[PDB]
Design a binder for these strands. Structure first.
Ligand SMILES: CN(c1c2c(c(O)c3ncccc13)C(=O)N(Cc1ccc(F)cc1)C2)S(C)(=O)=O
Ligand SMILES: CN(c1c2c(c(O)c3ncccc13)C(=O)N(Cc1ccc(F)cc1)C2)S(C)(=O)=O
Ligand SMILES: [Mg+2]
Ligand SMILES: [Mg+2]
Ligand SMILES: [Mg+2]
Ligand SMILES: [Mg+2]
Ligand SMILES: [Mg+2]
Ligand SMILES: [Mg+2]
Ligand SMILES: [N+]
Ligand SMILES: [N+]
Ligand SMILES: [Zn+2]
Ligand SMILES: [Zn+2]
Lengths: 368, 184, 368, 184
DNA sequence: TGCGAAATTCCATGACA
DNA sequence: ATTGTCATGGAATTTCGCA
DNA sequence: TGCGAAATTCCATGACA
DNA sequence: ATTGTCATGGAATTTCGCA
């Protein structure tokens, strides 16, 4: 502060004030003649207030804050003090965007068997058709085989009615869903427990986690749209046709239709495949088991050049889910308790609860 | 001649009238000939109309080459014939008064009637809700002749609901007395 | 058709039916024994109906259609006939997504002088503040200097009132806006004509075209949010502070604030720059002219590996603006009349009018 | 001593009462000392309150180091002093009854009054709408002493509205007769 | 005539309804 | 008839202070 | 033992509220 | 306590038909 600047004026060396410049006095203020011009050196005890005043003008980041300060002042390692303030400005931390991308996505293993895992979701509201507004979509993880049910609401009751019909065929080990109201109710939880079905939930506000069914939603809507061109949007009577049409469509990368992955043989549909006509059912189920295991599986894509990956104890911030107008898009900093996988973590909020959260709804707190 | 396959032949028939359950009175019974897999659909009448509506559900999952039935009115109607023609399904009738299926199907249809009868008594009006558990039971029942359940033959995997307790299927002394009381 | 298949059966060579395979008859149908098995060769006159039936099952693309057909049939160059049908399926053409990206963005030259070009836009609705719900934002292209006006509606009348106040300072050559209702009215057109101001409009539904002002909107909202943290969203009394705060914020890449680009000297604001204290105004305006011309200007980024660029006479399709539920996302094919620049074109719709359109709202029609 | 600059000194003063225009009665006049640039703000009163509200508009564009005024009530109030202190603006008063500016400012203020007077006559109630065109005129008027308009000195560029017709600024015989009729 | 560290520049990331 | 933009904060690169 | 063309595979693009 | 996916149609690569 005042002591340091004193020793400086009488020509002695203080660490980080380069010796080759002349430090003088003028108007009660320590100054120095630097290449860009004459700048005031304030006492250390004044520096935090300066950095803060500069920063607060427009809540600027590193360089735009520094450029204001440098207009009047110089002192050793200015950016160190700028960055210190940025790391403490609650407003900047919860309002600013991140400039680090997520690490590359995981490609979870395809469920080993039909019925190992169902992915379920709702589509809608659609235009009213016979009183119906939504579609329950159930996709078998291994095969892609899909079941469609029209509903009047994305409700637990309609979910349970529909799944009682579906599970007449088989009971799945796990049902994966998003956190829609219909799937998270205790009624639905009971329904699953009664049947020994494990409920598995996506991390919140992260539809990629239901990617299997979401992607089928796309095809469902695309086909319905094409069949409805130049007609009123009477979609109810088409659900069955669409179900059957898609369950029997080839995946160019797999060379198999979801029906073939489920049954190992085409039913009486158009252009049925006949290659196993001479096999016994048993020989056929044998070839099916082989086909099921050898399916193409994608790998984790390359990371982007500026991704971040979560580390236990790191400060990170959860994205606000439905942020009000003119309100921050981020919650206050919180801590990574556990790294479940490189794209999923448990955080302590600061109130605080444990939340399991997608890395896509996180940014790493800036400036540590 | 080519080996027998799922979807080669579905055998259909009605069971009922039954005591009302959620307004339903019959069960359309569908059995896959090769695998012995059973689909059950509750209906309000043994009509072409209820048959078409129910088979529309099943045939939006898988389409049989041949449907076999007796000469029930619902199945010999020209509307049902139109329906099947539309879908490329061949219809096949057993001669009147002489129903013939296969051993497998016959035995299956037998189990269906007996299992229904068993679980209805005590709660003759709550069968609509039990249809799912009935089908799972039937389709996860081991076939003495083949080493496999219908579930296994259809999907080529073990199931997550195996029915290890091969059940009595016969009416206990109480239930015979109860069944003869409900018929009073 | 029947003649061709006849000559084939009696062992002669027909072009495109490879000689090394044996073509026979069975059940009234020409067949052939191919590595994968025995396939029916239908008569040419039957092939279009087959391709169409296969395609219509689920309105599948090239491979998924082919895989159905190949289950039963073989003939020469099947995909040629598949692609022919895909190019004629109106439903697929207007429903499917594109899988070709736009060519890289243009970086238009910075307007040469302050007042050469204004970019204007509305932000809102915001939470009501003193009866106000919107903000008119005016950004000078060259300097980034910004003016803010609170309004009760994004209306022409409020636009005109605000701009009468602004143009008291200077009158701009060109005002660029998007196609908001307030800017496209004939009242506003008159207002501009009265003043010799040229009105310039973005292509429709393409906010990047107003990028200059849009990007300033971001900062405006970001600053307002930070200043409103833990307070009611009373933003009206902050517009002036925000205006002044941003007009005096440094752009780290330019090393200048919009105020400095406009005036060549800081006014009495905090941390005012003093480097030209010893220059005459004239020497100062001299240095300003030099600074204005030497500003960093970005270049067109590299094209993505699968971009398309428009060519005169090409069939392309305009994206439907607000597509109804279960309706196509694309209009019917239309033709490129003129390529205004590699990212902007004029098309004839097919009704049809001339539309000037962004390449981002176009896909090139598939299969020609 | 350092050369004179824009924003070094703003000279402020009120003109009016004027005939009502959209409910307005005065014009707060602000002139940049170095450049001669003019900002005009219509007010309902020569009060501190109207002065603060108007200067808040201007000072959200640029802040003067020094504001110069006469000892008008609105400018000597402690509220106005508070306002200026808040913004780091030094206040500066000419002595009572002895108004002093600069030659440039004096001449500018002169032009303002004369140009106002001229365009009000005929339409003494429509001046509120004309304030913009007035300021453009003033700020695109060539300065005999300097080779440049205020626009040019402020922004360092030519303007898109040059006022090539250096106007009469004097009242024609009709207007003198009309002005003496409106004063009846 | 080269070293360690500070300063500056680079630039991918994301958001403007 | 028109066209993306730029604050941000880690990392990469250059410059500084000293010898 | 190599050529032209057809067939197959590759894979960026975009959309699932 | 959890995790993206896959139809699509040009282009790149491999295979086919023939010699
Ligand atoms: C609005 N959100 C929701 C979405 C979906 C749901 O089914 C939801 N169900 C319940 C509640 C919220 C849901 C859904 O299908 N989305 C479309 C989608 C699919 C895949 C992608 F990669 C991107 C977007 C968004 S979200 C998850 O909060 O952003
Ligand atoms: C809803 N659309 C509109 C937007 C904006 C307007 O100001 C509009 N004004 C009038 C009418 C429609 C407007 C606007 O600011 N956007 C935000 C934005 C900015 C830059 C980007 F790169 C992306 C998005 C969208 S749009 C153009 O149809 O998609
Ligand atoms: Mg959902
Ligand atoms: Mg969804
Ligand atoms: Mg019968
Ligand atoms: Mg707009
Ligand atoms: Mg906008
Ligand atoms: Mg006065
Ligand atoms: N996995
Ligand atoms: N340009
Ligand atoms: Zn801040
Ligand atoms: Zn189609």
């Amino acid at each position: 502060l005042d002591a340091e600047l004193d020793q400086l004026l009488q020509g002695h060396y203080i660490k980080g004030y380069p010796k080759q410049y002349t430090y003088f006095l003028e108007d009660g203020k320590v100054k120095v003649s630097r290449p860009e011009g004459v700048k005031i050196i304030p006492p250390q005890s004044d520096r935090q207030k300066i950095v803060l005043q500069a920063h607060n003008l427009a809540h600027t980041g590193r360089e735009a804050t520094l450029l204001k300060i440098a207009n009047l002042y110089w002192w050793p390692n200015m950016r160190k003090d700028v960055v210190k303030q940025l790391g403490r400005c609650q407003q900047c931390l919860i309002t600013n965007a991140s400039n680090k991308a997520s690490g590359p996505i995981l490609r979870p293993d395809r469920p080993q068997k039909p019925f190992d895992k169902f992915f379920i979701d709702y589509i809608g509201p659609l235009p009213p058709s016979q009183g119906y507004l939504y579609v329950l979509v159930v996709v078998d993880g291994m095969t892609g085989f899909t079941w469609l049910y029209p509903t009047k609401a994305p409700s637990t009751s309609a979910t349970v009615k529909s799944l009682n019909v579906l599970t007449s065929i088989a009971i799945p080990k796990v049902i994966h869903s998003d956190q829609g109201a219909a799937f998270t109710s205790s009624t639905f939880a009971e329904w699953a427990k009664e049947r020994g079905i494990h409920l598995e939930f996506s991390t919140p506000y992260h539809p990629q986690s239901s990617g299997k069914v979401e992607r089928k939603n796309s095809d469902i809507k695309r086909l319905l749209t094409k069949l409805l061109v130049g007609r009123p949007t009477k979609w109810y009577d088409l659900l069955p046709v669409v179900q059957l049409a898609l369950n029997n469509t080839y995946s160019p990368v797999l060379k198999y239709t979801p029906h073939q992955l489920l049954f190992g043989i085409d039913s009486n549909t158009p252009f049925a495949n006949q290659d196993t006509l001479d096999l016994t059912r048993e020989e056929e189920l044998s070839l099916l088991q082989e086909i099921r295991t050898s399916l193409y599986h994608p790998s984790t894509p390359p990371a982007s050049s500026r991704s971040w990956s979560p580390v236990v104890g790191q400060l990170v911030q959860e994205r606000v889910a439905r942020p009000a107008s003119l309100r921050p898009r981020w919650h206050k900093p919180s801590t990574v308790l556990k790294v479940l996988n490189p794209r999923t973590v448990v955080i302590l909020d600061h109130l605080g609860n444990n939340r399991t959260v997608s890395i896509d709804n996180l940014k790493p707190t800036s400036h540590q | 001649d080519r080996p027998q396959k799922p979807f080669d032949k579905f055998f259909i028939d009605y069971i009922g009238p039954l005591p009302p359950s959620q307004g339903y009175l019959y069960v359309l019974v569908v059995v896959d000939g090769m695998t012995g897999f059973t689909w059950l659909y509750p209906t309000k009448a043994p009509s072409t109309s209820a048959t078409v509506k129910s088979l529309n559900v099943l045939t939006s999952i898988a389409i049989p080459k041949v449907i076999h039935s007796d000469q029930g009115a619902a199945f010999t109607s020209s509307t049902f014939a139109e329906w099947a023609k539309e879908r490329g399904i061949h219809l096949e009738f057993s001669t009147p008064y002489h129903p013939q299926s296969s051993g497998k199907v016959e035995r299956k249809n037998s189990d269906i009637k007996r299992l229904l009868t068993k679980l209805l008594v005590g709660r003759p009006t709550k069968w609509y809700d039990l249809l799912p558990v009935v089908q799972l039971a039937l389709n996860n029942t081991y076939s003495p002749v083949l080493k496999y359940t219908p579930h296994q033959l259809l999907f080529g995997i073990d199931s997550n609901t195996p029915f290890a307790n091969q059940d009595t299927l016969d009416l206990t002394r109480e239930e015979e007395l109860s069944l003869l009381q409900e018929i009073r």
